[PDB]
Design a protein around this nucleic acid. Structure first.
Lengths: 108, 105
DNA sequence: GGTATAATAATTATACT
DNA sequence: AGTATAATTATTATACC
């Protein structure tokens, strides 16, 4: 029967965007990006979806929202060590994806 | 500018939904990576039969879990992790190790 | 070993600043 | 660098057999 830690982990992983967002941040310089970077490179995410996800990720303490006192002010999203570790745990998923997924496949 | 892998993206279409990762992991720890409908329903604790059925059809389309008909005396219906499904299950171990170290609970 | 029907929760579309 | 309103999907809650 089922690992309740794994159950908990899918409460974030088993929803839209979370996995892709933490993977994207793990690849950025300093593991950080602005709202507009993520919207641009995630391609099909809406601003409202991106805002909600970032806020849930901040609650899960996977992503940190930092106010930077530059002029004008910058707002950057940065992976926590906990988030960075989760990002590492996704590499073999990436590997599986490049081995087994065919993008031409059709489904209902 | 810092593009996302399309294959990873496609993978999250299954993983980034309710139940799919849990079902694939469950099936990976069953004898012969096989289970009956009621087995999964009982062991997943809180899944509705309709969510289970939908998800099993979803996973069949991805060719992750095959629904097999064993034409015995009363017919048995078995859901079976494919080799592709087994590889996915394996690739979920480091996530489970991360959960151990970080999740609270 | 599941389906039918109905309601809720998650996600997206659009528009806007 | 995000919010607002409304629609559309995804998921669940009950029944039922």
């Amino acid at each position: 029967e089922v690992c309740p830690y794994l159950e908990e982990t899918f409460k974030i992983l088993g929803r839209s965007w979370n996995g892709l967002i933490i993977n994207y941040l793990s690849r950025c310089n300093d593991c950080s990006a602005h709202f507009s970077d993520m919207k641009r490179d995630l391609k099909t995410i809406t601003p409202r979806a991106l805002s909600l996800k970032l806020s849930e990720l901040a609650q899960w303490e996977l992503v940190e929202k930092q106010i930077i006192s530059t002029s004008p002010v910058q707002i950057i999203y940065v992976l926590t060590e906990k988030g960075k570790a989760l990002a590492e745990a996704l590499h073999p998923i990436e590997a599986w994806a490049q081995s087994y997924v065919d993008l031409t496949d059709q489904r209902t």
